[model samples]
Target: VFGRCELAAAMKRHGLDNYRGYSLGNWVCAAKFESNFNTQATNRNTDGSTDYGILQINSRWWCNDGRTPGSRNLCNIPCSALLSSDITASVNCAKKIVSDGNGMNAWVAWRNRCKGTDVQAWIRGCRL
Candidate 1:
């Protein structure tokens, strides 16, 4: 499990501290599906374009912003790759995608899909 504490701490550093639920598990699954947690993984499109890194970011555009490896480009790779556990990549990307909302919307969406549940019920049904 990647040394549970070490992995959990890494996940927390990337803003994924909420491990009481299944988000962490789902994140791990996604990373495996995308890159098998190999940061240097790369692939090519059927049309001849190339994409690289764990998230399969297209080289043409990612490198253009001077953000690819050796370019100190944050956009070229998932922010979590530079910071912590691969699990947080989706959360980090979500922040950039949503602009103003919380960095958690992506995780929330994934949790909804996999858990088939809602935060509304969890919060409302809980008693202090």
Candidate 2:
């Protein structure tokens, strides 16, 4: 787990700041809702999709389940890498996901929790 400011600083250093034209607050807010900065987090969705890591990259699309044949593995990395405390792989994969189309709309948490709000406070104390 991480404090909000710590997570915000980490994310900014990873080049998440205003990537794809989204504010740093957007990334911080999404990460907050997705995993609360718990790098080891994982979730099994009711739809049978698995979400991994702080960013909750989906095994169904963004990563290979390994057990599932012909999984996309779009990020070209194992889903397990997303579960590590070193977030580089997850951040890279998330950047790829953001580039492909929906931008932050790719995340329900972004749409529901981070959008249309003064999310600036999420990173207020961070020195980004």
Candidate 3:
């Protein structure tokens, strides 16, 4: 796992803090439970759509891997880009996902793990 502070800072740098009225704490909490701050993380779902990157954005609706059928390609990005060490595409895609009226609830981790919790602790020392 990577450092929480590092991941939090990067997310903030990508304009995620308070983006769409969601708090930095909410983003930090989602990242922690979704990928544990690991940039290269990927989770293959039973539905054959894989989740990619620190935010675990879904391939079925958010991105294209060409392998996942019925993808909407809403983020207009390749799933592989989400697994890269540099996560500009992933972060931008996350922003798009949040914009789709799902907000952070698009991530199950957000609903089950971050919802109704003290998310601020996730960014306690991130200085942002």
Candidate 4:
């Protein structure tokens, strides 16, 4: 759905650069490890839930797949909606995730790989 720089640009337009005290590089770097910019990505988590899309929003709490046992569907959208390239729904949910007290820590990948790291290299020459 997006290239490295293209995803960064789209995210910039959505105000993710500093949305939760996280830089554009942080989000971009996280996304890199999350889904490799693939909107159609899906991963069945070990917790009986699934993650969806470029940001890997979870079906357990963030989106509904109608099959997750304890889904909160916090995003209030079908999980399938997150699989599209449009990304609007995914972005909305991502912002909510950050604001809901977890911040970037919502993404384990972000904390493990992006947090406290100099993520500037992820966005270097990205033209966002």
Candidate 5:
């Protein structure tokens, strides 16, 4: 059970439903990029770094601003703790990143370079 506002916001921001160019072709690929599409996926990078939850909230500096110190769960805090099981929250965090203009611009640059590229390829290049 998810909230409509969050879901709708995510859908509107990310073009989730109308993903014509980025169809759900490979689960492995999408998952590889998007936290394996799991609610509680965690990853540690090659630089001996780790990120928590699905959306991978790397900004520990902002943790105190929001989020609870507990295991990953949906609605663990406001729609800002992007690393929890709250897909809507994750989406909201993602929206902020995109709306910040810098990340979105980087995304656009990456997208421009990887037109028609598969998820695996994207992951390989971007380390998503």
Candidate 6:
């Protein structure tokens, strides 16, 4: 239920904008395509892994769902952490992902939908 501008402001304040060489718009646009900005969003993948929360972090490598086989749980947090409305845990995990050299490419949505597109338009009317 988050409006685009509001979500962008929150993310920008967390230093997501160009945090790892990707613009805030890129993050914002990717979230849009990933979960429609829904914090509680969860979707099952073909590999029996589930993507959690607005950023759609996968359970296989990023978090512990207690059920995903071979979960690395690199974030060391429960997958439910990604679904909280506060977004603090989500942003922290995202920074971890980018800082670990994944960059924005970890998100397939970003590679396909947000990358090379008019990403600036994703935050055109927003100010943070």
lDDT of each: 0.41, 0.88, 0.86, 0.90, 0.40, 0.90
Please provide TM-scores, in order, for all candidate models, with all chains considered together: 0.41, 0.93, 0.94, 0.95, 0.41, 0.95
- Candidate 3, residue 83: the lDDT equals 86
Error of 2 at 56 (Å): 0.6
Please estimate how well model 6 matches the true structure, expressed as its whole-model Cα lDDT.
0.90
On a 0 to 100 scale, what is the lDDT of residue 64 in model 4? 90
Shift in Å, residue 78, candidate 5: 8.5
Off by over 4 Å in 4: none
- Give the alpha carbon lDDT tens digit for every residue of 1-128 in model 4: 68989999999998898887888998898889999989999999998999999899999999999889967988899999999988888889999999998789999899999899999888888778
For candidate 2, write residues 44-127 as lDDT tens digits.
877677899999999878887675454578898889999988889989999999999888999999899989999998988677
Per-residue lDDT of model 3, residues 12-128, tens digit only: 888998999988889888888889888889999999999988889888998898899767888898888998888699889988888988678888989998889988888886764
- Clash count list over all predictions: 1, 0, 0, 0, 1, 0
Clashing residue pairs for model 1: 67-73
Candidates 3 and 5, the one with greater lDDT: 3
User: Cα miss at 108, model 6 (Å)?
Assistant: 0.6
Off by over 4 Å in 2: none
Q: Residue 76 of model 1: what lDDT?
A: 49
- Candidate with the larger lDDT of 1 and 3: 3
Clashing pairs in 5: 31-36
Off by over 4 Å in 5: 1-32, 45-49, 60-84, 104-128
Per-residue lDDT tens digits for candidate 5, residues 55-100, read 4543332222233343233223432355555456654554444444
Instruction: Compute the lDDT of residue 4 as modeled in candidate 2.
Output: 87
Which residue window of length 10 is worst by lDDT in model 4?
14-23
